[PDB]
Design a protein around this ligand. Structure first.
Ligand code: MG
Ligand code: MG
Ligand code: MG
Ligand code: MG
Ligand code: MG
Ligand code: MG
Ligand code: MG
Ligand code: MG
Ligand code: MG
Ligand code: MG
Ligand code: MG
Ligand code: MG
Ligand code: MG
Ligand code: MG
Ligand code: MG
Ligand code: MG
Ligand code: MG
Ligand code: MG
Ligand code: MG
Ligand code: MG
Ligand code: MG
Ligand code: MG
Ligand code: MG
Ligand code: MG
Ligand code: MG
Ligand code: MG
Ligand code: MG
Ligand code: MG
Ligand code: MG
Ligand code: MG
Ligand code: MG
Ligand code: MG
Ligand code: MG
Ligand code: MG
Ligand code: MG
Ligand code: MG
Lengths: 68, 231, 56, 252, 120
RNA sequence: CGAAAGGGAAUCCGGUUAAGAUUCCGGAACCUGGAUAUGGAUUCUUCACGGUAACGUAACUGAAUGUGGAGACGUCGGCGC
RNA sequence: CUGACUGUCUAAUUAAAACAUAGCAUUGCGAUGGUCAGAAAGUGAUGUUGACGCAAUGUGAUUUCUGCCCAGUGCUCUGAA
RNA sequence: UUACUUAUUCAAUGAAGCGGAGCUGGAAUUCAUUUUCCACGUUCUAGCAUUCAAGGUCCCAUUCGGGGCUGAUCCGGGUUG
């Protein structure tokens, strides 16, 4: 299934593809509020992994803390 | 008529309160408007790697509408159809024999991303349509080249919303047929032939080219001006 | 005093002329004159700078 | 040691400006189509006095380019200006005292008040009683006109920045001796709790580094290095020299 | 196509704005009327200072609820006793009780009405 | 939210108690919000006359919008009342 | 002898000659800044401000002057390296 | 040493008139052509400037009410620095 291609993609974090995705999305996130509800996991292969089943009553939230 | 006069307005600087023109350009739109507007825009400058620039290549209205009217002939079982088929098959076959094979071997469109993948993986599929708008894009980026290596004819179609209702859903991402009744295999070729000359033989050459740029309007005519004028 | 004028009759809050309250007699005379001379001399500005039109 | 006075001023509290009696802040007109392109008349409705600011303020009423209404802007009265004057503002304006023109649009040698650093900040330079910048020259290499500010520092700004012809009214304010102490008391009553000033060599060593005694002297140098720490900056700071000079003229 | 916006300003588009259609009705059975008449007017204030008021003044002096108001006082004197109430006057006693003075219209005799209520 | 000393819709004399009163009694007012009718005014030149004028009067239709005024303002001093 | 003066302070042992003052002199700064505040900050004072300004030291009305020294401490620099 | 504008940074505005090009029209070169320049509502006055605008032109049979296109050139949706 498609997940093993998400897992393996997600591990080439300096591949030119991801860098570009890393860029565009790290920009998108800054603009929305610091805690904002997530329409749907950016990483479906991973939210799956850590427990998330894509069903009612599961909730994914994105968040931004401050480094250092 | 000469009892009405023709008193004309000036609307130049320093006189005549300006007339309600149109401000759609100058609207201070909601934040969530600009974000989606500016993410595409951002994704328009900066060079785009090819494996994402592979998309944008959608399809012509014609082969699209061709490949749809074809796929439309293989809808899944609807609710009340699987309903009665099971009141039919289950009730009688378990009151007799024919291991549930109380029904014709079906010919549906097949969908579900992991699923359509294991198809392509196993060389069981015949024509795969990948939507050009999935998010994240990684959900699909491997397909165009996963397809190519298995040699499974693919094509990057327009509408994750179309393929959806094409498989009786809100959205679908992928839709790909492996079977098809024998009365159709002829349109198969003429569709795969013309496609496999846009999404297949083109692949190798296409992945060698990135996208992005497009200074947008102002700064581009300004370089269209520095060039035209200063040369 | 201000709210007391709301318990009183319009003849107590005006004279009978352009700008009842608001402006004072001579301030409306100057209002008038200035108005008349400006709009007149406007045309004068127009006709004259239409003589310089058909001059060139 | 204690917290010396000049640090206690940063938080606010007692030292914040007294502003009750102040007419609205002085600012030019916002840089609109009109001024960016043509000009726009206005009448000085009155010239008024803004507390603790010797320098009269001018009130100029401009019809609204876009809606039926009047917008009163608050200018600093540039001397010569007079109730009833007409103030024209904008690239195309003419060269008269009181009008506000971009720095591009004025010849060299024009002296000019309330000029903007960055075009459209509504006024930055020479807003003090009787001050004025001077245009020293232009340079079409980005609309940047070179001007001389009242310090004498000739700093380049963008010729799209606006000014207002003439010099700031309120001429020789600081030529009259304040004489007695009350005069000065009232001066700052309308400004900020800055006065009187105690010398720190009166203090004890805890409220100032000049502090301790047995003899009112300063101790070591009274020139402190640009990059000392607050609590040691008191005295002549980055003093690149000291002593009497009579300097004559400035930087040209 | 497009759309003509004469206002640079975007505003929250007016939306439906429904209306509460429950499914289990908050309270079970609404409260009975707190401050009924007998609750309003609490007790007659029979003191020689106040008797002389009923005698030579046509005033009925009742202690009343603190929640009560002038309107409510005039009401329940008027219903419980079948009398017209010129005007009501309330002062809050030092022990927290709300003494109300009620003058009855020239129709009714407050002294009659008084040993009518049963007290002299 | 922040003034029982700032801004602020309108009450007065007489009388009364052992102790309350610009509250109570007696008389005479005024403000506000709400109601509505009659008298008047206006009108065939429909939305009033007069006075050269400053202005007058028992009135004398006025939505948006604009604007102007009152609220609203230091201190001393001599002079007038 | 002292401090120019009016003025301020050790509530409860010091009212002075001390502190302040006006006046004089000096220093930093043109906002991408000077000084100062904050754990941080889409933070804050000066600032409704812009050198006739704000900030920081000295001396202490007027008059009259304000010499010599840049080696040391320190501050400063369109300076060789 | 430096061009880019999307990250980041700062200024304003009730995100109005930015950017490219066109009507109109007055001069030019070229030994004729488009090869470009240029301009295109306000300055004796302490008035007035608002009702999707009067005009113009199409519609509904139009009884009074509406509406549209010009009036206000078009094309980019980079609010503007
Ligand atoms: Mg959901
Ligand atoms: Mg940290
Ligand atoms: Mg089904
Ligand atoms: Mg300390
Ligand atoms: Mg303040
Ligand atoms: Mg004020
Ligand atoms: Mg002097
Ligand atoms: Mg203060
Ligand atoms: Mg003080
Ligand atoms: Mg001093
Ligand atoms: Mg001192
Ligand atoms: Mg001491
Ligand atoms: Mg110390
Ligand atoms: Mg030290
Ligand atoms: Mg000393
Ligand atoms: Mg009471
Ligand atoms: Mg309050
Ligand atoms: Mg009434
Ligand atoms: Mg006013
Ligand atoms: Mg007051
Ligand atoms: Mg006054
Ligand atoms: Mg002696
Ligand atoms: Mg003394
Ligand atoms: Mg003294
Ligand atoms: Mg003592
Ligand atoms: Mg002792
Ligand atoms: Mg003493
Ligand atoms: Mg010194
Ligand atoms: Mg002293
Ligand atoms: Mg001296
Ligand atoms: Mg010396
Ligand atoms: Mg000598
Ligand atoms: Mg030395
Ligand atoms: Mg040396
Ligand atoms: Mg050095
Ligand atoms: Mg803008």
């Amino acid at each position: 299934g498609a997940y093993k291609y998400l897992e393996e993609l997600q591990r080439k974090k300096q591949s030119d593809v991801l860098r570009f995705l890393q860029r565009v999305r790290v920009w998108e996130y800054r603009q929305k509020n610091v805690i904002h509800r997530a329409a749907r996991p950016t990483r479906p292969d991973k939210a799956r992994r850590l427990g998330y089943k894509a069903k009612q009553g599961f909730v994914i939230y994105r968040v931004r803390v401050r480094r250092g | 008529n000469p009892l009405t006069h023709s008193t004309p307005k000036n609307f130049g600087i320093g006189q005549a309160v300006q007339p309600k023109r149109n401000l759609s350009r100058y609207v201070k739109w909601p934040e969530y408007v600009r974000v989606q507007r500016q993410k595409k825009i951002l994704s328009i400058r900066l060079k785009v790697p090819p494996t994402i620039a592979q998309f944008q290549y959608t399809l012509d209205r014609n082969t699209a509408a061709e490949t749809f009217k074809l796929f439309n002939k293989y809808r899944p079982e609807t609710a009340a159809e699987k309903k009665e088929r099971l009141t039919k098959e289950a009730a009688a076959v378990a009151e007799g024999k024919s291991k549930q094979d109380a029904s014709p071997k079906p010919y549906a469109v097949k969908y579900g991303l992991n699923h359509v993948v294991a198809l392509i993986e196993n060389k069981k599929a015949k024509l795969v349509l990948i939507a050009n708008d999935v998010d994240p894009i990684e959900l699909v980026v491997f397909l165009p080249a996963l397809c190519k290596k298995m040699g499974v004819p693919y094509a990057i179609v327009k509408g994750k919303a179309r393929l959806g209702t094409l498989v009786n859903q809100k959205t679908s991402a992928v839709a790909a047929l492996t079977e098809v009744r024998a009365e159709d295999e002829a349109a198969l070729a003429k569709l795969v032939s013309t496609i496999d000359a846009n999404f297949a033989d083109k692949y190798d050459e296409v992945k060698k080219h990135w996208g992005g740029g497009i200074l947008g309007n102002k700064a581009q005519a300004k370089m269209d001006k520095x060039x035209x004028x200063x040369x | 005093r201000p709210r007391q004028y709301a318990t009183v009759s319009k003849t107590h809050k005006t004279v009978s002329r352009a700008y009842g309250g608001s402006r004072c007699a001579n301030c409306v005379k100057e209002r008038i004159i200035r108005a008349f001379l400006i709009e007149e001399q406007k045309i004068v500005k127009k006709v004259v700078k239409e003589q310089t039109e058909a001059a060139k | 040691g204690r917290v010396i006075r000049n640090q206690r001023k940063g938080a606010g509290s007692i030292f914040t400006s007294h502003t009750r009696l102040r007419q609205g802040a002085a600012k030019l007109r916002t840089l609109d189509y009109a001024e960016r392109h043509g000009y726009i008349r206005g009448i000085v409705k009155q010239i008024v006095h803004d507390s603790g600011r010797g320098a009269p303020l001018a009130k100029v009423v401009f019809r609204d380019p876009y809606k039926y209404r009047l917008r009163e802007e608050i200018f600093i009265a540039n001397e010569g200006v007079h109730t009833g004057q007409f103030i024209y503002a904008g690239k195309k304006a003419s060269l008269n005292v009181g009008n506000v023109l971009p720095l591009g649009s004025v010849p060299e040698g024009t002296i000019v008040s309330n000029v903007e650093e960055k075009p459209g900040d509504r006024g930055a330079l020479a807003r003090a009683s009787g001050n004025y910048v001077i245009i020293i020259g232009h340079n079409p290499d980005e609309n940047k006109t070179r001007v001389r500010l009242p310090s004498g520092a000739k700093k380049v700004i963008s010729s799209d920045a606006r000014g207002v012809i003439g010099v700031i009214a309120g001429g020789g304010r600081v030529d009259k001796p304040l004489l007695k102490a009350g005069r000065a008391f009232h001066k700052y009553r309308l400004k900020r709790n800055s006065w009187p000033k105690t010398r720190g060599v009166a203090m004890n060593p805890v409220d100032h580094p000049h502090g301790g005694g047995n003899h009112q002297h300063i101790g070591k140098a009274s020139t402190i290095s640009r990059g000392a720490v607050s609590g040691q900056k008191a005295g002549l700071i980055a003093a690149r020299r000291t002593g009497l000079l009579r300097g004559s003229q400035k930087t040209q | 196509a497009l759309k003509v916006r004469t206002s640079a300003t975007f505003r929250l588009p007016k939306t439906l704005k429904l209306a509460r259609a429950p499914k289990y009705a908050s309270k079970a059975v609404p409260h009975y009327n707190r401050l009924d008449s007998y609750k309003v007017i609490e007790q007659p204030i029979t003191s020689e200072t106040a008797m002389k008021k009923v005698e030579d003044g046509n005033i009925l002096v009742f202690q009343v609820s603190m929640k009560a108001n002038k309107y409510q006082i005039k009401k329940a004197v008027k219903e419980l006793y079948e009398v017209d109430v010129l005007k009501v006057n309330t002062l809050v006693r030092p022990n927290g009780t709300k003494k109300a003075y009620v003058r009855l219209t020239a129709d009714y005799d407050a002294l009659d009405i008084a040993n009518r209520i049963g007290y002299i």
